[PDB]
Design a protein around this ligand. Structure first.
Ligand SMILES: NC(=O)CC[C@H](N)C(=O)NS(=O)(=O)OC[C@H]1O[C@@H](n2cnc3c(N)ncnc32)[C@H](O)[C@@H]1O
Length: 529
RNA sequence: GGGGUAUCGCCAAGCGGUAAGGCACCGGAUUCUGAUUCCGGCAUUCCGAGGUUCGAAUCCUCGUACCCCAGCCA
């Protein structure tokens, strides 16, 4: 529960509302990130928990910054997280005629006028955080002039920035938002929904309070930065002819360590080509996390754990990872894969190989078992073999033994190096009947695999606070290794995850996984304390 | 100027009754994944200083730290 749900519990009792109607209003100017997910869970979640409704609305009031590819990807991420919206998808653009009419009502009430102060002059006239603003020389035009002038704007008779429609409120308000905020500005740009029918587009504050009201929204849930805007929201609805008046509630936005959480910065990583795309597995975007191996259920869990409050916060990466581990640890089938392979021959072994049985999930027999090929020439991880090694080292030591996962116990004996003195092959012997512990893969039946290890995109906890966050990108946020996996992964599918025993959770696709050379993304490593 | 928030390393309950939970962490027990699972520990303190009260983190007062607002962006 959170303060917002508590308010709603009250409202229901008193009877202010008998139904709750929320909305998720993203602007299609980029892809959604994990923060947007916190918002999606909140609005859609509250709706379903209270047998209510939640609209998916595209706040598409700025043509030049938006693209149809963004609206497309947003519907996708909302669906993927497991949420359904009310009726058809909505667009603010659906209300452009409506907004135009409401602007005309304000002008008629002398509550709005066409200003001709250039874009620079408006800031010069606006005042400062400590000094009040001053009325524009065009502030007292007659209703008739404003009316004619607005029509000229709409008709395209003014060059961009040469004119705008402003609300007539209070140039001396301590609330900068109330200093005659702009309602409309000129833009000769094609809109992804309205094409070229308009050359004037409504501003955010004007559009949003009216959109909510026409949609019957009961609880407009937004983030803390729109707190000051609150008085403009109510001003507009109080001054036009509209029957409902939605209530606002702000909660703090999500921040995750070692990453950025704004579309502007995420876009720069995309445009400057420092990540493959919005959906790069290293990105905090919904799509990137999906591609990374996270389950929607893991994300919904995360959002449930972090809560909804009014306090600034930065969650630690451990928390998000904990969520994905809790999921995959329970549902992901296990398999063998060697990321850093080194040949190990069993001079003692006789034949072309045999078959050994391995549980698909140890702690869960109900998940079944599989048949895995074993032989005398296998691959183990270079890190699991040491010639010396101290006491705690429970792996393979030149002279000691180690149990090969779900197989036989073997003893290291003769190693073999090359030029630089690197080991090329490890010879051992196996105990005919014997069935630390290391994983392995039979070299003859092994599937050549590309393994992509990922890590924090940035080297610092708060890359957003850097002068140049790009210069603080982590050069090892992605390292590609070529390894070997048990033949069983031959049928692996994109999306589905597996636990590479003693390594971590991995999954296919990665946009690169083909038929010949499979590519696996390490979703997250195993807890190694 | 105006608007917010300050409870254990990171999140977060508590709305006058004398400090939930999660993540992280530190111990021990299981375990053919040094995983998991499993028991145990972890703020006598709630930004600070006063005041009212039988009694406050929860009310009031003065402070202090931090966040947001001066786009014809959202
Ligand atoms: N009052 C409002 O709702 C304004 C919505 C505005 N068009 C907007 O913010 N669009 S947006 O596409 O940028 O984001 C859409 C919603 O996502 C929320 N949001 C954005 N970043 C968030 C974050 N880091 N954590 C939690 N929530 C976050 C916004 O509040 C908005 O409602």
């Amino acid at each position: 529960t959170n303060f917002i749900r508590q308010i709603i519990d009250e409202d229901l009792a008193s009877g202010k509302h008998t139904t709750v109607h929320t909305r998720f209003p993203p602007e299609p100017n980029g892809y959604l990130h994990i923060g947007h997910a916190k918002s999606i869970c909140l609005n859609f979640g509250i709706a379903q928990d209270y047998k209510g409704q939640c609209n998916l609305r595209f706040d598409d009031t700025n043509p030049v910054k938006e693209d149809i590819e963004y609206v497309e990807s947003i519907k996708n991420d909302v669906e993927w997280l497991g949420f359904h919206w009310s009726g058809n998808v909505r667009y603010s653009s659906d209300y452009f005629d409506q907004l135009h009419a409401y602007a005309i009502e304000l002008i008629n009430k002398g509550l709005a006028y066409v200003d001709e102060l250039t874009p620079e002059q408006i800031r010069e006239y606006r005042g400062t955080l400590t000094q009040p603003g001053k009325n524009s020389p065009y502030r007292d035009r007659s209703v008739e002039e404003n009316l004619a002038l607005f029509e000229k704007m709409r008709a395209g008779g003014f060059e961009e920035g040469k004119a705008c429609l402003r609300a007539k409120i209070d140039m001396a308000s301590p609330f900068i938002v109330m200093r005659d905020p702009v309602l409309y500005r000129i833009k000769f740009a094609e809109h992804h929904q309205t094409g070229n029918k308009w050359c004037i587009y409504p501003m955010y504050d004007f559009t949003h309070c009216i959109s909510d009201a026409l949609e019957g929204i009961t609880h407009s849930l937004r983030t803390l930065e729109f707190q000051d805007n609150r008085r403009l929201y109510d001003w507009v609805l109080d001054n036009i002819t509209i029957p409902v008046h939605p209530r606002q509630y702000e909660f703090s936005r999500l921040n995750l360590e070692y990453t950025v959480m704004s579309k502007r910065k995420l876009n720069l990583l995309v445009t400057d080509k420092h990540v493959e795309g919005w959906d790069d597995p290293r990105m905090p975007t919904i799509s990137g996390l999906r591609r990374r191996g996270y389950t929607a259920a893991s994300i919904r869990e995360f959002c449930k754990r972090i809560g909804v409050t009014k306090q600034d916060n930065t969650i630690e990466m451990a928390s998000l990872e904990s969520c994905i581990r809790e999921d995959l640890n329970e549902n992901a089938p296990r398999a063998m894969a060697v990321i850093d392979p080194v040949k190990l021959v069993i001079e003692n072994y006789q034949g072309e190989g045999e078959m050994v049985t391995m549980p698909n999930h140890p702690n869960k027999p109900e998940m079944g078992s599989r048949q895995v090929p074993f032989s005398g020439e296998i691959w183990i991880d270079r890190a699991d073999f040491r010639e010396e090694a101290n006491k705690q080292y429970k792996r393979l030591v030149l002279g000691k033994e180690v149990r090969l996962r779900n197989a036989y116990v073997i003893k290291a004996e003769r190693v073999e190096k090359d030029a630089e003195g690197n080991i090329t092959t490890i010879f051992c012997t196996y105990d005919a009947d014997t069935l630390g512990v290391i994983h392995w893969v039979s070299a003859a039946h092994a599937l050549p695999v590309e393994i992509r290890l990922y890590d924090r995109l940035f080297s610092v906890p708060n890359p957003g606070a850097a002068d140049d966050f790009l210069s603080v990108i982590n050069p090892e946020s992605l390292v590609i290794k070529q390894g070997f996996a048990e033949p069983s992964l031959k049928d692996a599918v994109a999306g589905k995850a597996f636990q590479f025993e003693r390594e971590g959770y991995f999954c296919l696709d990665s946009r690169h996984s083909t038929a010949e050379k499979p590519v696996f993304n390490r979703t997250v490593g195993l807890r190694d304390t």
